[PDB]
Structure 1
Amino acid sequence: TMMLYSGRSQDGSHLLKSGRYLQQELPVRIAHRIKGFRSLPFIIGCNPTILHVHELYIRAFQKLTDFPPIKDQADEAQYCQLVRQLLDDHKDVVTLLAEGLRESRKHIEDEKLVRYFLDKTLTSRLGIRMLATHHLALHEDKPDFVGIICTRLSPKKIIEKWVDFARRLCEHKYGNAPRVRINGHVAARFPFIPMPLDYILPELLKNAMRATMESHLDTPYNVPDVVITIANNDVDLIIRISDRGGGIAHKDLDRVMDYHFTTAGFGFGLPTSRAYAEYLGGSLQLQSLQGIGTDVYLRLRHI
């Protein structure tokens, strides 16, 4: 449904076609988000933070539609400025929704409703930001990238990037962090879009590390490694993240995938990651060994 244009061209004609495609596509997608807010239960839609986000989307739609049809490179250039502005203006939207919904959702009893709204809203948003960021990136001169598409992504490398990140957060909080071993198809390289991994990987790694530290309070200086296995085949990329952090309790298991649920970010890591994975044609599955640890399986389809 959403096209990431991979074409390049000397005169910069492909930038024009891309820009014109965005211009047709973005207002429509934003209008769908606005309809989602309009259909929220009244009591939730009246929450001042939800109203703020609703108004941001209306404002986005207005600016996008106010922008004249792109006729030349000069126009396309100014359109990119608008798109950059909107991307920035909306950067905290996930956090505002989480906040606005936290209490308000407790009112209504159809708890399916908020899950559906958040799944639909956050995944459409991911898709919108991918499209827009892709267009902007077409102007960049990065080797191994066409827009936001890496032509030879290494799962091992991007995993290591987020491992370093998560380990530093963990070390800050607990004074130590599990080491991470990576095995399986460590030398794999293939065309792939980093952005979803950039959201999902740190969420899963933070979870695994927290769980490991909290279950080893007596030996923070000596905790079990987290073990990550990469499997690359013609159909999908599988990343298994296995910890010895004690598992997800039976009493918690049916709730960990709910937005807002946490035993402690703000309980969004798992449901958001799963929503993103499925949006892109993959999945996120959990296997809990209560008393031992948890295996988390991220699957993403190849391009």
Structure 2
Amino acid sequence: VPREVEHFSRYSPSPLSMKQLLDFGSCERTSFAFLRQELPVRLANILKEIDILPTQLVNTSSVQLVKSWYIQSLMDLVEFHEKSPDDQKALSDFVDTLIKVRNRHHNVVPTMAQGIIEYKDACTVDPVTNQNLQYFLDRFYMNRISTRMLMNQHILIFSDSQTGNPSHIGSIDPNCDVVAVVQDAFECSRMLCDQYYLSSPELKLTQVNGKFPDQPIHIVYVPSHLHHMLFELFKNAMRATVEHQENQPSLTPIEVIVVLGKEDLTIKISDRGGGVPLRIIDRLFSYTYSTAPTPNAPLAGFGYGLPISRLYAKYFQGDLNLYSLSGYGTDAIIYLKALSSESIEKLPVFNKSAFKHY
């Protein structure tokens, strides 16, 4: 283990709120000062943790690759430790380095998932029931969600060439039109559903602005994250509805209700897709668990939709739960904090405690 990894793994990650992230777009040297220290801390924490996985898994070429990438990115960032935040050239080179790191990590999720599979056929193992593997993957993916979020925020606000969405500050939409994201995600799921079944359920949507009656619903949020969650939940609800009702003349719609309360934004997605036994609910949330075979774009198969969507919801202190009525249908519920100041990063830390779980 490189001394840099050992050293920086000693610190605990420092979570930011969405408000703080927005404010970076309200100087560059402040974001530079924070990130050149924080990214190595987050990378070092997860690198130490990778060094605990089963010999058989850590040795998969896929995991070894991811490990090599994170180490290099860590080194690239630490090289900025000497520079002054007032050094304009250093700031520019830092943006270039974040772009390089972002590009290097672009295929991390797919490589790690492939490692899980290079693990299954190269060893005897059930990833679904492997509790340590599940614990690790949640932490590994949350760590990635957080580093990607932080680097993209800096790149999209301060770079010259990458501006992202004009209406966003970084990747954050201060006035996220939730219902619009819902409608977009639904249509994306629908197009996919049609290719697999030549039919798809329609959307029945209701919205209630409890905080401001009859007003459009907006909150500060990361639309790409919201879109991901909804897309995955819609794909699930559509697949279940169509298959459960394939022997019937028509399809019941998917009912969605969007509610804005004083401190929470809640989205409920209900289907009449037959549901699942309460006994199986937790399994649904395990990485790789799927009733479809492991896989242009697959409607189902990866076994990632639920756990990853839940990570996005919990990343800023929200949550995602499934409550099913076996024999009838399922209600999927997303909770998001309605205040940017309470939307604080939920980050895994490598410490005595975490180690105890392993």
Same fold (TM over 0.5): yes
Alignment correspondent of 1:233: 261
Q: Cα distance, 1:217 vs. partner?
A: 2.1
Alignment correspondent of 2:74: 61
Q: How does 1:1-303 map to 2 (within 5 A)?
A: 1-3=14-16, 4-8=21-25, 14-67=27-80, 69=83, 70-102=85-117, 104=119, 106-107=124-125, 111-139=130-158, 140=163, 144-185=167-208, 187-219=216-248, 222-250=250-278, 252-264=280-292, 265-302=301-338, 303=340
Q: Cα distance, 1:72 vs. partner?
A: 2.8
- Unaligned 5+ segments in structure 1 are none
What letter is aligned with 2:112? L
Q: Cα distance, 1:280 vs. partner?
A: 2.0
- Unaligned 5+ segments in structure 2 are 1-13, 210-215, 293-300, 341-358
Q: Per chain length, whose mean CA-contact separation is higher, i.e. which structure has more relative contact order (CA < 8 Å, sep 6+)?
A: 2
Q: CA RMSD in A?
A: 2.3
Alignment deviations for residues 197-229 of structure 1 (CA, whole Å, 9 cap, x no partner):
13211111111111111112234x721111111
Alignment deviations for residues 102-161 of structure 1 (CA, whole Å, 9 cap, x no partner):
363654898221111111111111111111111122234965432222121111011111
8 Å CA contact 1:2, 1:131 repeated in 2: no
Q: Distance in 2 between matches of 1:276 and 1:191?
A: 15
Q: Distance in 2 between matches of 1:36 and 1:83?
A: 23
8 Å CA contact 2:274, 2:327 repeated in 1: yes
8 Å CA contact 1:247, 1:294 repeated in 2: yes
What letter is aligned with 1:175? L
Structure 1 residues 189 and 275: CA distance shift in structure 2, 3 A:
closer
State the secondary structure of the residue aligned to 1:138: helix
Instruction: Give the TM-score of the pair, scaled to structure 1.
Output: 0.90
State the aligned residue count: 298
8 Å CA contact 1:2, 1:127 repeated in 2: no
State the secondary structure of the residue aligned to 2:77: helix
Q: Cα distance, 1:261 vs. partner?
A: 0.7
State the secondary structure of the residue aligned to 2:262: coil
What letter is aligned with 1:126? I
Q: Which aligned segments of 4 or more residues in structure 1 are displaced greater than 3 angstroms?
A: 105-110, 139-144, 249-252
8 Å CA contact 1:274, 1:284 repeated in 2: yes
State the secondary structure of the residue aligned to 1:168: helix
Structure 1 residues 101 and 154: CA distance shift in structure 2, 3 A:
same
Instruction: Give the TM-score of the pair, scaled to structure 2.
Output: 0.77
Q: Distance in 2 between matches of 1:141 and 1:74?
A: 23
State the secondary structure of the residue aligned to 2:283: coil
